[PDB]
Amino acid sequence: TEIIKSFKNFILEFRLDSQFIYRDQLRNNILVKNYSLTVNMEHLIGYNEDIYKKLSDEPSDIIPLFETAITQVAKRISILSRAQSANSLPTFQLILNSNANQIPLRDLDSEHVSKIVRLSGIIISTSVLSSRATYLSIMCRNCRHTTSITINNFNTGNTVSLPRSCNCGPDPYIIIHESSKFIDQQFLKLQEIPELVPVGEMPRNLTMTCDRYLTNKVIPGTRVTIVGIYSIYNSKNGSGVAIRTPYIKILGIQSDVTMFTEEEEEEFLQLSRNPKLYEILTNSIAPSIFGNEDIKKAIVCLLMGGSKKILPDGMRLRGDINVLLLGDPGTAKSQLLKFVEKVSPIAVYTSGKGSSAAGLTASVQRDPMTREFYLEGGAMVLADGGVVCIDEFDKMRDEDRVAIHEAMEQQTISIAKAGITTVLNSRTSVLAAANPIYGRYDDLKSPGDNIDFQTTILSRFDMIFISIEKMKRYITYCRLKCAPRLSPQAAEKLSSNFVTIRKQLLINELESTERPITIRQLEAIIRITESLAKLELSPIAQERHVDEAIRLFQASTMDAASTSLSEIRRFEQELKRRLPIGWSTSYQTLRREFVDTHRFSQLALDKALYALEKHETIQLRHQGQNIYRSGV
């Protein structure tokens, strides 16, 4: 006791020039009715040393004395305010955030228990609000005797239960939920760093608990730095003998290693001097993979990132794009995926459909305990701000496929489910290796048309076709360090290119050649050049630096290369002037006509038809409904 008076003087006497902060901050939080206060514990060790260590030693005791020392002034301020000029005051909640000593999540001693600990991770599933009656008034039914139970700190023990005694017995005691004050158990579960460094193992994760002003502040997937209390709950053996599952009481939380040795920067800058740097780089990636050079470099410009522009309005251009490895096996793509997965600083290889238990996308899973919700996580939620590796991309569930196509453009996924509307960000960049269908004929077939009925997927996809442990560090280095920017001369060069492109290409499309040119394609080229200038690390682009990109993308175009009046003349004239009921005229009769006109391909047939239902020939709607599986 009366150390509280030291906390009252700490709230008051402690002053940084020119202004004592906590007095003001409190005065507002009450004015805001925040019933909350934020402490930097380091600042306390600054003002009062002994109290600080006193705290870090055994906070379980002290924290409440803080809270009282606060509410004691809070009453004074409260009255001085309410009276000039215009109870019931609860014990405030203080959020203490220290940036000082991180702990590796993989590394926690049993000596940290019931002591203040700061460490960080990625929140997988932010669990799920509950009601904590921390003050609860009780009544004996027969005895009519009344009581109140107040539980200050708890795991999820469950900590406390009702008494058994008021004949009157068994437990007569009856909860009056009138007089009880309930708090929110978030029960977030903190997962460690996924990219590093179990690397052989499923990474370990921790259970957290968040009350009152600490609830709901974070969407899971948000990297955060927790100040919390290492603690343990017995729970129920899933264990033994005597093992107690630890857990972290979290107070408070500071939401969001980039630091490296000088020598790393040095050797970096040395490599930066390399003229063959891009070339030798292109040599580093695919030691085993023979060739696939366009692909080889493509990975490179991919990892380098690209232009990210938040420039007003909130419209934020993104980087960097997408990669399509699709093709027949023997291309090594599946392995290469593993490879980049290695090289990429933060990478998640998920081929699916998602796998196995992991939702391919950020998913909402109720913490079954505490109920309410927690982010179930997904590939993207975890891979955000990094690489995302997808295979069998054609095999993916439609449900997530949408969210893909959406987030891919927006980098943001929005989850409206139930009481949670949050929109979450995936800065992840996706590279996809599809398996094309039926083989070389798909190239003989229109280069597109392979994806669902919708090449739209392809429209979204931009590119369609050293120890490397250091290169990781370098990749990080260049990535964080420099934001390149573009040269006007190159810019106009590009204008000429694309004009020749859409121009010559439309001139090619005058014949309705089945195949494209997107402004998106242009921007892709852009982000490519930015990627290479960031490979050069230069804040500024070079026109030649672009000239490369132009040709490379021209190869991707080559990959892209490999009659509506006629087909609709056929189909429409058929329907219209042949069998209006359509009866007798179905898949047989078209099979005859087109068979006898030698223009039928089943894909072409169903393509013109799906076009007709899809152009809403509602007669084609109608015929589909009937004549189709009516058959003829």
Next chain:
Amino acid sequence: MSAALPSIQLPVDYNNLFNEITDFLVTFKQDKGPKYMAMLQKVANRELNSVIIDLDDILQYQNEKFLQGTQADDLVSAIQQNANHFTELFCRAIDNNMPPNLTRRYFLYFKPLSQNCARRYRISSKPLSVRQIKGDFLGQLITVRGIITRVSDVKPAVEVIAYTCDQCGYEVFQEVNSRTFTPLSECTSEECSQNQTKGQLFMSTRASKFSAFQECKIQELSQQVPVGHIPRSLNIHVNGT
């Protein structure tokens, strides 16, 4: 126990009323035999299955009994207010006087007053909208007007179930509700009770009380429908005659 499930006195007094019932009943005037007597024998001749009650002749019975006192207790205001009891109790009042509920054989219906009788001056019938219907009218006798939808195929519904101990003899009368029931077994026979061996009972269909209900849902006349919203619907109970 007292102080649990309290009693509360109300202006309602059934004792005198039931008497009043017996008085108006078949001892009636306006309609040589009094209407209820003769009608009652026509039923007693076995010819007439259901009995339609009318409150207007009750209104007349009261103006007879008002004037021409002594002042007699008001049944109408009590009937429409409860009327549920009034059914069964009225039934008993009748069952005595003829030219238990198990052997009745007759159905009792009532006809509300609008009317010129309202104009007497004397509510029970105000034809109403389902909108106009408030959940506070529950238990009230009400008259309404609306569009018949649904209007169902009568099916026999059983009231009470008769099993016979055949050891203890007697009978087992199980009333039944809602959709389903579980048939009783052993014997509840007071003689089969406390015996070392209870009789076994099996139902007899000839004995039990069954009824053909007939179902309907009714919709707002839709002219009555408020400007907005949509016309409401309502279920209705009908059985026997």
Next chain:
Amino acid sequence: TFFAPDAVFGDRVRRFQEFLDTFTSYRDSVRSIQVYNSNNAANYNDDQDILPHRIIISLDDLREFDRSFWSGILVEPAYFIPPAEKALTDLADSMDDVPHHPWKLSFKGSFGAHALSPRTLTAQHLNKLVSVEGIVTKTSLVRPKLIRSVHYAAKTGRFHYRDYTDATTTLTTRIPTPAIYPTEDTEGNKLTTEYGYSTFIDHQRITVQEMPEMAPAGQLPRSIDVILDDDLVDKTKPGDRVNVVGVFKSLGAGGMNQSNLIGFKTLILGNTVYPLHARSARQMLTDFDIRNINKLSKKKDIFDILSQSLAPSIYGHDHIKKAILLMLMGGVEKNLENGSHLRGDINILMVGDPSTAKSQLLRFVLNTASLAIATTGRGSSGVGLTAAVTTDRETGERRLEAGAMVLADRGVVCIDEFDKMTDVDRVAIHEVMEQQTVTIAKAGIHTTLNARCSVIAAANPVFGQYDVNRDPHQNIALPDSLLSRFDLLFVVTDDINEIRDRSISEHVLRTHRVTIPFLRKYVQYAKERVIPQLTQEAINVIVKNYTDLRNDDNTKKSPITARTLETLIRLATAHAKVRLSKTVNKVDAKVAANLLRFALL
């Protein structure tokens, strides 16, 4: 006799005597209620030969009258409330005693501490009297709920009583006592139950989101349900915007009861629960901004500049840009006297090959849009629909969970992959769009609800890029009154020109390396102030145009309807709003003409 009167209760009631005697205003008000009932009672009896019992109470009085009763009810509604309602029922009995119920109170206020919104709520606010505002969904479908029990006992005659205290009964909770259904009295005499003696009350419970408007930048919404019964039941539709006075209940055991996480289902009771009006931002224009508007309003060329302000990123489509603007504005709204309302707002539609940014733009729309929801293809369920949330949630009152359009009423609905969406929906859309309202009979709550939201939609060319040369129809691919219904239909083309392309790529590159903030500001004030009304100045021009339109166009193209005309109307009125003109002008007409032409050609 119960637990016998407590001078706690006694003094609480007694203390609440002088009030309401002072202020006596209520003293006669109740009498008014009684009077009304009496008169209606005479109408039923004599002619063929009703009102609720709650009376509002302004909390302003207490502070002056009783600061401690003020503070007490606010804090301890549990204690203060019931004795007060008692006092009320008593005085009520006093007013007219002779002829032969809760007699509740609204508790007006004068709020509050205790003024908080559904986002910021509990744990201290737990079990205090609260006022929260927000939208109405998921609503509820009322169920009648029963009260007090009555039983006849033969041969003993007599009668019984029983009562039932809901978890929702009172507000602040209580040690619950299950009473089940009284029967078979002890001594073993059976109890014949009686209705019409046994009282009942209708029941309803609805959910309340935090005010969409006031919602934060972006996040998950946090809503709370409240129970409403009898009188309180049914007053408002899902999608209504309202502020509710009711206590915060913790009700229910939170799992400590059954020994074998989440806890303590909590809810708001009633109570006052006022429906409130809101437009169809926030914002703060101070002095300076409003001035800035004012000066700028004079600028003759301002409109084009505006039309430009939208597309930092987008070349061209200034026609379109202008269009969007007009969408934001929207030709006021007209509800004729005792007759249907003229739709003010306009529905827009765009058609072209992808990369048209059509997707992209829509975002930009959503941005400064001031609400509203965006929808993409399918999409659904129900879109704007309440789904008639089954079952109940809570109490037996089956919820109506207000959907997009209802929620988007007053607001901008973005329809993406509009072609993709199911005709099943489209049928409804016909109603929503034109009829301007939604109607729900489903099971169920039979009501028609109003979603006034404006509409834009983007949908792919029927198949491939073929839109360009394709016939004006069948390029369409979504007949028909659909086509009619969108006030605006825009065909964009991706066809290439090298000169044009250069022009693009310049802008493009530059991008990689009239302030919109002021925009929405300029918008809101314009919105609330002021309506241009209309002027015969233009009327001629318009008719001239329209006749020219049906006339020459039906040869040229189609469809031209009265719809076309109305669209013109809304168009002009908006343009005046852009002009800020309190009147319509013939110039604005020339504009709407130009645009409509562009639409046609």
